[PDB]
Amino acid sequence: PNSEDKNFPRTVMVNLNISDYYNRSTSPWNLHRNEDPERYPSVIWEAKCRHLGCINADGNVDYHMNSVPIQQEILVLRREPPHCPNSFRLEKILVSVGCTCVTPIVHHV
Amino acid sequence: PRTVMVNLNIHNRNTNTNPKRSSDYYNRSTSPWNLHRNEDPERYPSVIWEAKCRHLGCINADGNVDYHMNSVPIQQEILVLRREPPHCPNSFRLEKILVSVGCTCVTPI
Amino acid sequence: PRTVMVNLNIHNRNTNTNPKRSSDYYNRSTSPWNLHRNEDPERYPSVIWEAKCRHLGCINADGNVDYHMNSVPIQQEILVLRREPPHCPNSFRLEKILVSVGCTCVTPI
Amino acid sequence: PNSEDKNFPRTVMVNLNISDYYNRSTSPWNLHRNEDPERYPSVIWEAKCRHLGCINADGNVDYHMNSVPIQQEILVLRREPPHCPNSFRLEKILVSVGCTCVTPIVHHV
Amino acid sequence: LRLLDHRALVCSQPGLNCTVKNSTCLDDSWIHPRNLTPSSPKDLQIQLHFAHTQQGDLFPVAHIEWTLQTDASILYLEGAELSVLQLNTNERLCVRFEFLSKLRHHHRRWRFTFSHFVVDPDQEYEVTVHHLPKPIPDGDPNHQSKNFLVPDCEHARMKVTTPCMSSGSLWDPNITVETLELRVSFTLWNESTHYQILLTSFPHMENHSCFEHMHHIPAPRPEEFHQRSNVTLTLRNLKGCCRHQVQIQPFFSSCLNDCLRHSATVSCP
Amino acid sequence: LRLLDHRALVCSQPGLNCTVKNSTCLDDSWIHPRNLTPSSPKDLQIQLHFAHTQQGDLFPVAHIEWTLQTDASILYLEGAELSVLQLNTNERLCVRFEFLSKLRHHHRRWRFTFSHFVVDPDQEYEVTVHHLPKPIPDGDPNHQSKNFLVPDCEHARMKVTTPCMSSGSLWDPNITVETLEAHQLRVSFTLWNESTHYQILLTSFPHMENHSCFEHMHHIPAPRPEEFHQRSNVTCRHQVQIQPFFSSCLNDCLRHSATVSC
Ligand SMILES: *[C@@H]1O[C@H](CO)[C@@H](O[C@@H]2O[C@H](CO)[C@@H](O)[C@H](O)[C@H]2NC(C)=O)[C@H](O)[C@H]1NC(C)=O
Ligand SMILES: *[C@@H]1O[C@H](CO)[C@@H](O)[C@H](O)[C@H]1NC(C)=O
Ligand SMILES: *[C@@H]1O[C@H](CO)[C@@H](O)[C@H](O)[C@H]1NC(C)=O
Ligand SMILES: *[C@@H]1O[C@H](CO)[C@@H](O)[C@H](O)[C@H]1NC(C)=O
Ligand SMILES: *[C@@H]1O[C@H](CO)[C@@H](O)[C@H](O)[C@H]1NC(C)=O
Ligand SMILES: *[C@@H]1O[C@H](CO)[C@@H](O)[C@H](O)[C@H]1NC(C)=O
Ligand SMILES: *[C@@H]1O[C@H](CO)[C@@H](O)[C@H](O)[C@H]1NC(C)=O
Ligand SMILES: *[C@@H]1O[C@H](CO)[C@@H](O)[C@H](O)[C@H]1NC(C)=O
CATH code, domain with A70: 2.10.90.10
Beta carbons within 8 Å of F204's beta carbon, 6+ residues apart: F212, F213, F214, F215, F236, F237, F238
Between the two ends of chain B, the Cα-to-Cα distance in Å is: 40
Resolution reading in Å: 2.5
Residue D36, domain member (yes or no):
yes
The helix/strand/coil state of E66 is strand
Amino acid of residue B101: V
Residues recorded for chain F = 262
Q: How many helices (H) and strands (E) does chain B have?
A: 0, 8
The Cα–Cα gap between F110 and F41 comes to: 10
Residue A2, domain member (yes or no):
no
Residue C2, domain member (yes or no):
no
The Cα–Cα gap between F83 and F105 comes to: 27
Beta carbons within 8 Å of A95's beta carbon, 6+ residues apart: A44, A46, A71, A72, A74, B76
**Selection from E220, E247, E231 nearest residue E185 by Cα:** E231
Cβ density class F191-210: b for 16+ within 10 Å, e for less: bbebebebbbbbbebeeeee
Would you say F86 and F23 are in contact if contact means Cβ atoms under 8 Å apart? no
* Cα E188 to ligand 3 centre (Å): 14
CA distances from F161 to E179, F51, F125 (A): 93, 9, 19
Ligand 6 pocket mutation, candidates F17, F100, F110, criterion most atoms within 8 A of CB: F17
Protein residue with least CA distance to atom 8, ligand 6 = F17
The Cα–Cα gap between F132 and F37 comes to: 8
- DSSP letter, residue E72: G
Residue C3, domain member (yes or no):
no
Would you say F40 and F131 are in contact if contact means Cβ atoms under 8 Å apart? yes
Q: Which of A13, A94, A101 sits opposite B30 (nearest CB)?
A: A101
Q: Which atom of ligand 1 is nearest to the CA of E15?
A: 27
Q: Decide whether any atom of ligand 7 lies within 6 Å of the F22 Cβ.
A: yes
Beta carbons within 8 Å of C3's beta carbon, 6+ residues apart: C90, D13, D14, D15, D16, D86
Q: Decide whether any atom of ligand 3 lies within 6 Å of the E174 Cβ.
A: yes
The Cα–Cα gap between F42 and B29 comes to: 44
B86 contacts in chain E (CB < 8 Å): 137
Would you say A88 and B4 are in contact if contact means Cβ atoms under 8 Å apart? yes
Beta strands in E87-194 (DSSP E): 92-99, 111-114, 117-118, 123-132, 143-150, 176-178, 183-187
The CB-based long-range contact list for F220-223 (8 Å cut-off, 24+ gap) reads: F221/F197, F222/F195, F222/F196, F222/F197, F223/F191, F223/F195
Cβ density class A20-30: b for 16+ within 10 Å, e for less: ebbebbbbbbe
The sign of the CA dihedral C51, C53, C54, C58 is positive
Protein residue with least CA distance to atom 2, ligand 2 = E22
Among the bound ligands, the one closest to the CA of F12: 6
Beta carbons within 8 Å of F98's beta carbon, 6+ residues apart: F18, F19, F20, F21, F78, F79
Residue C102, domain member (yes or no):
yes
* CB spacing of D86 vs C28 below 8 angstroms: no
The sign of the CA dihedral E199, E202, E204, E205 is negative
Residue D93, domain member (yes or no):
yes
The Cα–Cα gap between E47 and E50 comes to: 10
Q: Are strands D61-62 and D54-55 parallel, antiparallel or unpaired?
A: antiparallel
CA distance C6 to chain D (A): 5
Please give the distance of CA E256 from its chain centroid, rounded to a whole number. 16
**Selection from E51, E124, E125 nearest residue E82 by Cα:** E125
What phi, psi does F165 have (nearest 5°)?
-70, -30
DSSP F21-51: EEE-S--HHHHS--SS-----EEEEEEEEEE
CA distances from F164 to A24, B105, D38, D109, F100 (A): 74, 67, 40, 20, 40
CA atoms within 13 Å, Cβ hemisphere of E244: 24
* CB spacing of C10 vs F26 below 8 angstroms: yes
- Cross-strand pairs, B62: none
Residue B20, domain member (yes or no):
no
Would you say A49 and A56 are in contact if contact means Cβ atoms under 8 Å apart? no
Q: Which atom of ligand 4 is nearest to the CA of E171?
A: 5
Q: How many domains does chain B have?
A: 1
- Cross-strand pairs, D30: D48
DSSP F132-190: ESPPPTT----EEEEEEEE--TTSTTGGGSHHHHHTTTT-----EEEEETTTEEEEEE-
Would you say B92 and B43 are in contact if contact means Cβ atoms under 8 Å apart? no
Residue C6, domain member (yes or no):
no
Can you give the residue range of the structural domain that contains B37?
33-106
Q: Which atom of ligand 4 is nearest to the CA of E225?
A: 1
The CB-based long-range contact list for F143-149 (8 Å cut-off, 24+ gap) reads: F143/F40, F143/F41, F144/F40, F144/F41, F144/F42, F144/F44, F144/F66, F145/C47, F145/F44, F146/F44, F146/F45, F146/F46, F148/F46, F148/F62, F148/F84, F148/F119, F148/F124, F149/F123, F149/F124
Q: Which of E249, E265, E266 to mutate to test the interface with A (most CBs of A within 10 A)?
A: E249
- Cross-strand pairs, E236: none
CB atoms near residue B36 (< 10 Å): 11
DSSP E196-265: EEEEEEE-SS-SS-SEEEEEEEPPPPGGGTT-EEEEE------SS--EEEEEEEE--SSSSS--EEEEEE
Determine which helix (DSSP H) or strand (DSSP E) holds D21, and give its type and residue range: helix D21-24
The helix/strand/coil state of E33 is coil
Rg (CA), chain D: 20
* E abuts C (3+ Cβ pairs < 8 Å): no
